[PDB]
Specification:
Cytochrome p450; 17 helices; 11 strands; 464 residues; binds protoporphyrin IX containing FE; oxidoreductase; globular; binds a molecule of 2 linked components (GLC-FRU); alpha+beta; Cytochrome P450; CYP2B35; binds 4-(4-chlorophenyl)imidazole; two-stranded antiparallel sheet
Length: 464
C-alpha cells in the first residue's frame, strides 16, 4: 500500500539508511534502490519522497488538491506552529493565502508601484557600493537590505535605512536562523525532536531568534493600531487589523492576533532570506564564470545603455540575462528537499495508497537537476535556458518556486526583484575578488531545508 522503501527499525526509523551528507544525499541513495516514489521513516513518521519532474508533477499538478496539504518542519514548529499563510492547512490556509495575495496586490504586487520601489532600492544599492570604492566586501547584509525593504514596504509600511541598528539585528537573526534551519543539526532534529528537544542544540537558538523577531513584529503591530486610520490602511498589517475588527463578531474567524503575528513573521522571513540568498549565489557564480557576466553586461549595453534604470519590460528583450537568472535559480537550488506537503485525503498514487495526512516531500532539487531536461545538470550553464536561436527556453522541470496549489505566493515579486537587482548592479559595476575563478567554491555552506552559499568577499568596481 505505501510506496516501497527500506524496512524501518523501532525507535531509529530509517536512520541506518541515512547519510551524514544530509537528507538530500540520503534520499538520493535510497532512490537508486527503490525508484522515484518511495517511503522513508523519519523517526517513526512515514514520509513519501517524490523524485524527478514527472513524479513531482503527477502529484502536485495532476492531483493538485490531494497533495495541497502542508506538513511540518520540527525545528520551527515551536514558534510558528501552523499559523499564517505558509504552514497552515484547510480553511485557514485557503482564507489566509487568498487574503495575502489580494492584500499584497493592493499595495503594489505585480504593479508599477512595487516596480518603482525596487528601482528605487537598486539605486540606493548602487550609491552604497560606490562609497566602498573597489574595496572588497561581504554582500550578505546589503542583499538582505534591498529585498527586505520591498516586503517591509508592503507589510510594515516603511523601508529602513542600511544603518538602522534594529534593522541590522533583525537581518542578522534571519541569516543565522536560515543557516541553522539548514544545518545537519536541524535534520537530525527532524528525526528525533521528541528526544533532542530536552537538550541544548540548533533548535533552541532557532526558537530564540524567531522569538526575538516576533517581539519586533509585536511592537510593530501595536504601533500600527495606534495610528490606524480605518479609511486609509497603509499596509498589510492595517488591512489585517481592519478585517480583524470587523470579524470580532464571528468566534471562529481566522483573523485573530496569533495568525497576524505569524502571517507577518512568515512574509518578513522569506522576503529577507530567499531572493537575497539567490542573488548572493548569483554573484559568486559571476565570480566563477566572468565570461557570463561580460555577456550579461554586453546585453545590458545593447538594450538599456549605461544610464537609464532597467525595467521589467527590458527583460523581455534580454533573453540571455533572463536565461542566466533562470540558471542561477536552477543551480542555487534554494529549497532542495522542497517543502513538506501531506495528503488531505486517502489518496491513490501510482498504485499506492497514501492515507490521509501522510507527509510528502517533493524533492524539487531532482527536478532542477533532472538529466532528461538539462544536459549537464551539475554544471552552471545559461544554455540550459537558451534555444538554438538564443531565445529563452522554458522548462517544465524549472520549479524553484514549486508547483500546484501551494506554489510560492511571492514568485512574481521574487522574479522581478532578481531581474531588476541583478541587471542594475551589473549595469553599474563589474565584480572581482582575491580568489581565482577556478578556486571559487560553489558547494553549499549548509544544505538542508534550505541551501546557502559559502561565505565570500566581493569587489564592486565602476566600469569606466
Ligand atoms: C527566490 C525566492 C523564493 C523562492 C525560490 C520561493 C520558493 C518557495 C517555495 C519552494 C515554496 C514552497 C512551495 C510548496 O510548498 O510547495 C514557497 C512558499 C511560499 N512562499 Fe516563496 N519563495 C520565494 C520568495 C518568496 C517571497 C518573496 C514571498 C513573499 C513575499 C514568498 C512567499 C511564500 C509564501 C506565502 C509561500 C507559501 C505558499 C503556500 O503555502 O500557499 N516567497 N516559496
Ligand atoms: O517556470 C516554469 C514553471 O513555473 C510555473 C509556475 O510558477 O509556470 C506556470 O505558468 C507557466 C507560464 O506559462 C505555465 O507554463 C506553467 O504551465 C504554469 O504552471 C510552472 O507551471 C512551470 O513549470
Ligand atoms: Cl519560516 C519561513 C517562511 C517562509 C519561507 C519561504 C517562502 N518562500 C520561500 N521561502 C521559508 C521559511
Ligand atoms: Cl513551507 C516552506 C518551507 C521552507 C521553504 C524554504 C526552503 N528553503 C528556502 N525556503 C519554503 C516554504
Amino acid at each position: 500500500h505505501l510506496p516501497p522503501g527500506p524496512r524501518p527499525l523501532p525507535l531509529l526509523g530509517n536512520l541506518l539508511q541515512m547519510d551524514r551528507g544530509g537528507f538530500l544525499n540520503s534520499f538520493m541513495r535510497i532512490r537508486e534502490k527503490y525508484g522515484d516514489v518511495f517511503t522513508v521513516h523519519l523517526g517513526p513518521r512515514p514520509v513519501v519522497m517524490l523524485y524527478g519532474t514527472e513524479a513531482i508533477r503527477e502529484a502536485l499538478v495532476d492531483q493538485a488538491e490531494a497533495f495541497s496539504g502542508r506538513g511540518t518542519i520540527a525545528v520551527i514548529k515551536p514558534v510558528i506552529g501552523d499559523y499564517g499563510m505558509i504552514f497552515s492547512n484547510g480553511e485557514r490556509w485557503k482564507v489566509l493565502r487568498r487574503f495575502s495575495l489580494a492584500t499584497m496586490r493592493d499595495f503594489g504586487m505585480g504593479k508599477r508601484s512595487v516596480e518603482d520601489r525596487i528601482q528605487e532600492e537598486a539605486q540606493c544599492l548602487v550609491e552604497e557600493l560606490q562609497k566602498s570604492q573597489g574595496a572588497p566586501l561581504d554582500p550578505t547584509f546589503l542583499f538582505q537590505c534591498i529585498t527586505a525593504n520591498i516586503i517591509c514596504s508592503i507589510v510594515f509600511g516603511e523601508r529602513y535605512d542600511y544603518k538602522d541598528r534594529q534593522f541590522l539585528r533583525l537581518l542578522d537573526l534571519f541569516y543565522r536562523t536560515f543557516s541553522l534551519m539548514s544545518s545537519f543539526s536541524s535534520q537530525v532534529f527532524e528525526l528525533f525532536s521528541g528526544f533532542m528537544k530536552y537538550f541544548p542544540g540548533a533548535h533552541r537558538q532557532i526558537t530564540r531568534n524567531l522569538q526575538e523577531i516576533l517581539d519586533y513584529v509585536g511592537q510593530s503591530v501595536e504601533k500600527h493600531r495606534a495610528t490606524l486610520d480605518p479609511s486609509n490602511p497603509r499596509d498589510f498589517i492595517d488591512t489585517y487589523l481592519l478585517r480583524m475588527e470587523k470579524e470580532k463578531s464571528n468566534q471562529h474567524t481566522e483573523f485573530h492576533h496569533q495568525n497576524l503575528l505569524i502571517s507577518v513573521l512568515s512574509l518578513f522571513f522569506a522576503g529577507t532570506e530567499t531572493t537575497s540568498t539567490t542573488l548572493r549565489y548569483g554573484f559568486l557564480l559571476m565570480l566563477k564564470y566572468p565570461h557570463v557576466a561580460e555577456k550579461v553586461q554586453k546585453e545590458i549595453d545593447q538594450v538599456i545603455g549605461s544610464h537609464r534604470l532597467p525595467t521589467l519590460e527590458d527583460r523581455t528583450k534580454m533573453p540571455y540575462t533572463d536565461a542566466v537568472i533562470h540558471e542561477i535559480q536552477r543551480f542555487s537550488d534554494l529549497a532542495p528537499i522542497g517543502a513538506p506537503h501531506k495528503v488531505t485525503k486517502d489518496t491513490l498514487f501510482r498504485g499506492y495508497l497514501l492515507p490521509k495526512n501522510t507527509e510528502v516531500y517533493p524533492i524539487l532539487s531532482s527536478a532542477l537537476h533532472d538529466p532528461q531536461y538539462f544536459e549537464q545538470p551539475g554544471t552552471f550553464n545559461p544554455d540550459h535556458f537558451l534555444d538554438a536561436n538564443g531565445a529563452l527556453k522554458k522548462s517544465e522541470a524549472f520549479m524553484p518556486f514549486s508547483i500546484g496549489k501551494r506554489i510560492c505566493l511571492g514568485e512574481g515579486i521574487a522574479r522581478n526583484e532578481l531581474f531588476l537587482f541583478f541587471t542594475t548592479i551589473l549595469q553599474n559595476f563589474s565584480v572581482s575578488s582575491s580568489v581565482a575563478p577556478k578556486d571559487i567554491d560553489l558547494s553549499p555552506k549548509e544544505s538542508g531545508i534550505g541551501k546557502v552559499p559559502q561565505t565570500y568577499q566581493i569587489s564592486f568596481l565602476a566600469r569606466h
